[PDB]
Amino acid sequence: KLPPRVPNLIPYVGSFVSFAKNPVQFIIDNSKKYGDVFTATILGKEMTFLNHPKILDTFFKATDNELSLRDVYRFMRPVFGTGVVYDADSTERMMEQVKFVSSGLTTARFRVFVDIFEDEIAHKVKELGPEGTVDVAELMADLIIFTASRCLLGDEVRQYLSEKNLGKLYHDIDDGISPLSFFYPSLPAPKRDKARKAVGEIFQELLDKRREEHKKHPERLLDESKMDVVDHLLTQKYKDGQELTDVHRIGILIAGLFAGQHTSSITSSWTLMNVISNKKVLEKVRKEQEEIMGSDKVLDYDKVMKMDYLEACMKEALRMYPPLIMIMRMARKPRECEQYIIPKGNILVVSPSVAGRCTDTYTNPDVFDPERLTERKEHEKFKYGAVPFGAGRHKCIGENFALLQVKSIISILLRYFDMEYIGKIPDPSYTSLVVGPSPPTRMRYKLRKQQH
C-alpha cells in the first residue's frame, strides 16, 4: 500500500545526511535499492521520490488541491514578498501574477531584447580588452543580470544598476536563502533581509518615476514593443477588478528577475563550457552561426530563431546539469502511484537531474552530445523523459525568453571572441538553492577582430 521506505539513520533527522551530502546521488542509490517510488524521513518530513519517466503523470497532471506548490515553496516569502506567488491569497491569484510577467515576454518585446543583448555585450567587451582570462560563471551572471533587468524593467533601470550595485544586492539575497530554509522557514537571515529591503526601495523609486513618465508620455502605452513588465503592472488589475498594491508589484518584479537570473546564467555557463571544450561541437556551432549571419554584422530575433543546433546544445546542458535539481508538491489528498498510495502530507519529489541521466531514456548519459537530441531524438522516447522546464500546469513560462537570452549571449560572445576553457569540465556543486558548476570555471579569450 504505502511505498518502500529508506531506513532512517536515527529518528527525526532520518536520511538527512546522505541526502544533504549529494541529493542526486542519494536518489539514484535508493531508486535501485527500493524501486521507482520510495519515501524517506528528512528533518521531520515524509518525502516520496518518483524516479521513473513512466510514472511522472501522477506528479505533473494533478490540480492545485490534489498537489500543492504553495505548501512547499511558501518559505520563499522573505525573498518574493507577502501576498506574492506562493504566498498569494489564492492559487488563482498566483496565476494572475504569473501572467503579468509573461505578458512582458511577447514576440514584440523579444525583437527589442536582442538589441539589448548586443548593447550590454558591447559595453562588456570594452571592459574585457582584446585578450585575457575570465571566470565564466561570473561573466554569465553579470551579463544575464544586466540584460534581464533591462528586458523586464525597461532601460531606465540601467544607471541605477551600475550606480547602485544591483548585481551585488541580488548576490546578497541569493546568498541568504539556504536549501535548509525549506525545513526551517524561520532561520533568520539578516543580510538577506537587508538586501531585499534595499532592492525594494530601488524598485519603489522606479515605479514612482514610471508613473510621472506615464503622465507625460501615455502614447508609449499603446506601443507593444515598448511595454515592459513594469508597464503591465501599472496598467492592469486582477480579473475580478481588484487593484494591485505596490508591495505586490515590487514582489512580482523581484521574483521575475530572481527566476531568470541564476538558472539562465548557470545554463549559459554549462552550455558555453561544453561547446568550447569540444572541437566537433564548436565546429557545427560556428558553421551554423556563419550560415545564419551571412553578411550582417548584428543579431536580430529571426536569426536567433534559426539557431537550432545552438539550442540543442543548450538543451543538452539542461539534461546533464539542470539548475533546479528537484521539483516538489505537497499531497493535500492521498494519491495513487503504480501499486501504491502516497498519503496526505507527503511531499512528492521529482528530480530532473535523475531524469537526465536515466539509461532507460539516454545512452551514455555522461557524454555531452547534442546529436542525441537533434538526430537520435532520444528525448522523445517517454512523454516525460525531458523535464528541464517542467510539464503540465506549472510549465516554465520563461522558457522561450531563456532560450532567447542564452542563445543570443553565446552567439554574440562567439562572434567577438575565440575562447578556450581551462582544465576539465567541473561537477555540479550542491551548496545552494540553484545548482551550478563548482569553481574555478575559467577561460582564455581573444578578440577575433582588433585595432592595435
Pick out the residues of the known binding site for heme b: 73, 86, 329, 394, 396
Residue 6 · residue 34 · CB < 8 Å: yes
Q: Is 259 in the site for ligand HEM (CB under 6 A)?
A: yes
**Can you say which residues are annotated as belonging to the binding site for Ca(2+)?**
50
Tally Cβ neighbours within 10 Å of residue 72: 19
Residue 293 · residue 114 · CB < 8 Å: no
CB of 424 to ligand HEM, least distance (A): 24
Interface with ligand HEM, residue 13, by CB under 6 A: no
| b/e burial code for range 408-444 (CB count within 10 A of at least 16 → b) | bbbbbbbbbbebebeeeebebebeebbbbbeeebbbe
Residue from 396, 425, 434, 447 binding ligand HEM (CB under 6 A): 396
Under the binding rule (CB under 6 A), the answer on residue 76 touching ligand 5UR is: yes
Query: Quick one: which of 56, 85, 206, 307 contacts ligand 5UR (CB under 6 A)?
Result: 85
| Residue 140, all three cell numbers | 554569465
| Residues in 345-384 that interact with ligand 5UR by CB under 6 A | none
Residue with smaller CB distance to ligand HEM, 111 or 394 = 394
User: What is d(CA 229, CA 260) in angstroms, rounded to the nearest whole number?
Assistant: 14
Q: Which is nearer to ligand 5UR, 317 or 443 (CB)?
A: 317
97 near ligand HEM, rule: CB under 6 A: no
* Site mask for ligand HEM (CB under 6 A), range 326-355, x = bound: -x----------------------------
Judged by beta carbon distances under 5 to 8 A according to partner kind, the member of ligand 5UR, ligand HEM, none in contact with residue 85 is ligand 5UR
d(Cα 254, Cα 169) in Å, to the nearest integer?
11
Report CA-CA distances (Å) from 182 to 178, 179, 185, 438: 8, 6, 6, 23
Q: Pick the closer one to ligand HEM by CB: 273 or 402.
A: 402
Q: Is 7 left (phi over 0), alpha (psi -120 to 50) or beta?
A: beta
CB of 379 to ligand HEM, least distance (A): 15
Residues between 91 and 150 with contacts to ligand 5UR, criterion CB under 6 A:
97-98, 101
DSSP string covering 83-105, please? TSGGGSSSHHHHHHHHHHHHHT-
What is the contact surface with ligand 5UR in residues (CB under 6 A)?
A: 73, 76, 85, 97-98, 101, 252, 255-256, 258-259, 263, 324, 396, 398, 433-434
